RNA sequence: ACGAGACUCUGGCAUGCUAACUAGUCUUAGAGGGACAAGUGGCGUU
């Protein structure tokens, strides 16, 4: 009796406690579009206008969001909303409606379910970096 | 309600031909409400070509060692003055949008010859994508030199970027340099 | 100088004292379909489409 | 001598079907096991407008199950992976009920006893054991055991008396009563392997399945030869009619049904999708699930498509 | 490159000739059966062997391949080797015979035979290819 | 596998003339149990179970005295 | 028969698993799984 999946990306994470209640949406724990970096405000507005209010009229979600890096915590928020919504629809109503809505959301873009595998590689041998080498004298 | 962005729509912009979508291709998941899709464009060849034209134009301007790849710059620039000009225009930028660059474009470049000799270059062409994007890169250099040591700055040339973007007539500057080199190389055809 | 859309059939490879030009072979689509060859710079994918803006440019081979 | 017709289509799925099981007493639970940490729920509708609607995506398995069995009442799901683990699912709470990790060897099967008295599992120590729910030793037989791994132990599918049927991939079959448990006769030298065995509800037959296809039939008292019915490739689904004496399986793409008096196929009429690519290979067939008594038949393939036909029997 | 070394090639070949019965085409099944019947001391090597055996079954399903001598294909081939036609090809009623071979047959004490139809020999003595 | 299959010993033997270095390397044989060889086999050796001879009549017919 | 590969370490992955009163299954580290040129096209005594 534990249906929770949260959302993690790169180094950041966001636990999304989803449960039935009055059915109102609370995001970021702060006003909708006031975020201080201001870099990626418009990107957050895709689902709330693409889906509608009736779709999310019964969802009570509470998010613990942590992580430094816009590419990390942002896009983690979208992976989290998509995954939590998909799990909730799969569990509570049916699977065909889940296929339709999840197909719509993950057909908007692909990067939702895939995180970047690139990571800093080890500093290598006899050189300042992983590939550069100390200047060779003749 | 499948309208692209918040002000355009894909239900009416048709060419009734399925072969001229080499420049604007909005029919599938690749469509972006904001070009900040992250990712890499150097992991393997043809993946820089598989960049959307918009994102290539907005990113490729990253040069020098201080603004190198910082995507925040590209996204802030493409948001700023875009938010302004959309409401302040009222009309369609489509005319200039299309009719400066996306057929300013050249139609050939030049390549090396034989085993020696750097006094002339044999004329070849490319499938228009690589030629158009080399012209776009030189136009990024030109927009720099129109900002670098000049008056008109970066993040205020959104008209010129839309010009560089859209579709099909000729008014450019770096591209007419490219066309002069076109003719020079074509003098061997 | 007609813009002719041709399909790539076989890509030869690179030429130059260090390698600076790429050979491909193209077949026309609606010009009494036949095959010619031409050199080209830059990325040209497997079986992509070339635009022969001119119907006479031939590349010397070797 | 049975007529059928494919009357519809079913599109949209994620996990192709592995094993089939249903209960006559409880028709409110129908399941299909998958191989991507997945199980699908079903309901019987038999409608052209709606032949199927997905309701429950039963998840919770950490590894691909080998065989899934049900008790007399369709209320307990006992599943065993190819690891030695065990998962029990009960509908009174709708979650994990009893999880067991107590077999440290690569056990290939699990089984629920009908009489709920003893438990068996396949270990690699060349010896079978009987276990209780109290965690004590009950009966271990070290002599005259299976030559290799023991696949499973089966009891009657229908309500009746329990008779232990031990089967293995070592081509050895044992039939035991709950009192004696002695090896009466033994025979060796099989040409083909044994996938699994089945228990007949009429209590006079014991078929076989495998690559060789020889359905070797023994009696119940001893190991007298009765007949080696024909087969094709590796057989993976055997069952009699719950109320009639027939035999059916799909050793490969087509359907192989037999009457114990004719022993041969009568008329193979089928329906297959066409492909404009001559090198697109078709999927494979493993099981045929009757609706409840043979008035309709279902099957699943590796083309993410479930194929259902209406059968008129006669 | 993805060239499969001699170890995986030999293992897959011996695996397919010994237990062709159990092995199939779907990678999951090949991997499972390969683990079951082959003591492979690695997992990556096990996957490589299973992939090559899958390729070899794609090869065998569309003809015979010289590396393996499976019982079923060899049985069918030998069955084809005991093929015998209803009428022997040497049961020719009329055999076309040139003048020189019938002269030989007459010198062979076989001249009474009437099956040999004496044919018209070719009048051209051009039988060697031109030089150049 | 050179770690757990080959043991090498390097020693110095002092002769009145000089010092002679002897390097002796032995690869143990594979034998499970008994700790006389490495437990794991060489990781490029694929083992196959051997079937036994099978020359059988066409049909198994029960025989009784 | 060495060498190459295989092999060890290393990062990359679970609406899975073995559980922590310093995190609330995200961090830590597992007897394990997962990729194999595998699926489909095009070149290859195919």
Swiss-Prot record, chain A:
GO terms for molecular function: RNA binding; structural constituent of ribosome. Pfam families: Ribosomal_S9 (PF00380). GO terms for biological process: cellular response to leukemia inhibitory factor; cytoplasmic translation; maturation of SSU-rRNA from tricistronic rRNA transcript (SSU-rRNA, 5.8S rRNA, LSU-rRNA); ribosomal small subunit biogenesis; rRNA processing; translation. It is found in: Cytoplasm; Nucleus, Nucleolus. The modification N6-acetyllysine is found at residue 53. GO terms for cellular component: cytoplasm; cytosol; cytosolic ribosome; cytosolic small ribosomal subunit; extracellular exosome; focal adhesion; membrane; nucleolus. InterPro entries: Ribosomal_Su5_D2-typ_SF, Ribosomal_uS9, Ribosomal_uS9_CS, Ribsml_uS5_D2-typ_fold_subgr. The keyword Transcription regulation does not apply. SUPFAM superfamilies: Ribosomal protein S5 domain 2-like. Keywords: Acetylation, Cytoplasm, Nucleus, Phosphoprotein, Ribonucleoprotein, Ribosomal protein. The keyword Nucleotide-binding does not apply. Component of the small ribosomal subunit. The ribosome is a large ribonucleoprotein complex responsible for the synthesis of proteins in the cell. Part of the small subunit (SSU) processome, first precursor of the small eukaryotic ribosomal subunit. During the assembly of the SSU processome in the nucleolus, many ribosome biogenesis factors, an RNA chaperone and ribosomal proteins associate with the nascent pre-rRNA and work in concert to generate RNA folding, modifications, rearrangements and cleavage as well as targeted degradation of pre-ribosomal RNA by the RNA exosome.
UniProtKB/Swiss-Prot annotation, chain B:
One of its GO terms (cellular component) is membrane. Coiled coil: none annotated. InterPro entries: Ribosomal_uS7, Ribosomal_uS7_CS, Ribosomal_uS7_dom, Ribosomal_uS7_dom_sf, Ribosomal_uS7_euk/arc. PROSITE patterns: RIBOSOMAL_S7. Keywords: Acetylation, Cytoplasm, Isopeptide bond, Nucleus, Phosphoprotein, Ribonucleoprotein, Ribosomal protein, Ubl conjugation. The keyword Phosphoprotein applies. CDD domains: uS7_Eukaryote. GO terms for biological process: cytoplasmic translation; regulation of translational fidelity; ribosomal small subunit assembly; ribosomal small subunit biogenesis; translation; translational initiation. It is found in: Cytoplasm; Nucleus, Nucleolus. Component of the small ribosomal subunit. The ribosome is a large ribonucleoprotein complex responsible for the synthesis of proteins in the cell. Part of the small subunit (SSU) processome, first precursor of the small eukaryotic ribosomal subunit. During the assembly of the SSU processome in the nucleolus, many ribosome biogenesis factors, an RNA chaperone and ribosomal proteins associate with the nascent pre-rRNA and work in concert to generate RNA folding, modifications, rearrangements and cleavage as well as targeted degradation of pre-ribosomal RNA by the RNA exosome. Belongs to the universal ribosomal protein uS7 family. This is Small ribosomal subunit protein uS7. It comes from Homo sapiens (Human).
From Swiss-Prot, chain C:
Its main location: cytoplasm. Pfam families: Ribosomal_S28e. The modification Phosphoserine is found at residue 35. It is found in: Cytoplasm, Cytosol; Cytoplasm; Rough endoplasmic reticulum; Nucleus, Nucleolus. GO terms for cellular component: cytoplasm; cytoplasmic side of rough endoplasmic reticulum membrane; cytosol; cytosolic small ribosomal subunit; extracellular exosome; nucleolus; nucleoplasm; ribosome. Keywords: Acetylation, Cytoplasm, Diamond-Blackfan anemia, Endoplasmic reticulum, Nucleus, Phosphoprotein, Ribonucleoprotein, Ribosomal protein. It comes from the Eukaryota. GO terms for biological process: cytoplasmic translation; maturation of SSU-rRNA; ribosomal small subunit assembly; ribosomal small subunit biogenesis; ribosome biogenesis; rRNA processing; translation. GO terms for molecular function: RNA binding; structural constituent of ribosome. Component of the small ribosomal subunit. The ribosome is a large ribonucleoprotein complex responsible for the synthesis of proteins in the cell. Part of the small subunit (SSU) processome, first precursor of the small eukaryotic ribosomal subunit. During the assembly of the SSU processome in the nucleolus, many ribosome biogenesis factors, an RNA chaperone and ribosomal proteins associate with the nascent pre-rRNA and work in concert to generate RNA folding, modifications, rearrangements and cleavage as well as targeted degradation of pre-ribosomal RNA by the RNA exosome. This is Small ribosomal subunit protein eS28.
Swiss-Prot record, chain D:
Changing residue 51 to F: No effect on binding to SRC. Abolishes binding to PTK2/FAK1 and reduces cell adhesion and foci formation. InterPro entries: G-protein_beta_WD-40_rep (IPR020472), RACK1-like (IPR045223), WD40/YVTN_repeat-like_dom_sf (IPR015943), WD40_repeat_CS (IPR019775), WD40_repeat_dom_sf (IPR036322), WD40_rpt (IPR001680). The modification Phosphoserine is found at residues 275, 277-278. It is a peripheral membrane protein. The modification Phosphothreonine is found at residues 5, 9, 95, 276. In the liver, expressed at higher levels in activated hepatic stellate cells than in hepatocytes or Kupffer cells. Up-regulated in hepatocellular carcinomas and in the adjacent non-tumor liver tissue. GO terms for biological process: cellular response to glucose stimulus; cellular response to growth factor stimulus; cytoplasmic translation; gastrulation; negative regulation of cell growth; negative regulation of endoplasmic reticulum unfolded protein response; negative regulation of gene expression; negative regulation of intrinsic apoptotic signaling pathway in response to hydrogen peroxide. Changing residue 139 to F: No effect on binding to SRC. The modification Phosphotyrosine is found at residues 51, 227. This is Small ribosomal subunit protein RACK1. The lineage of its organism: Eukaryota, Metazoa, Chordata, Craniata, Vertebrata.
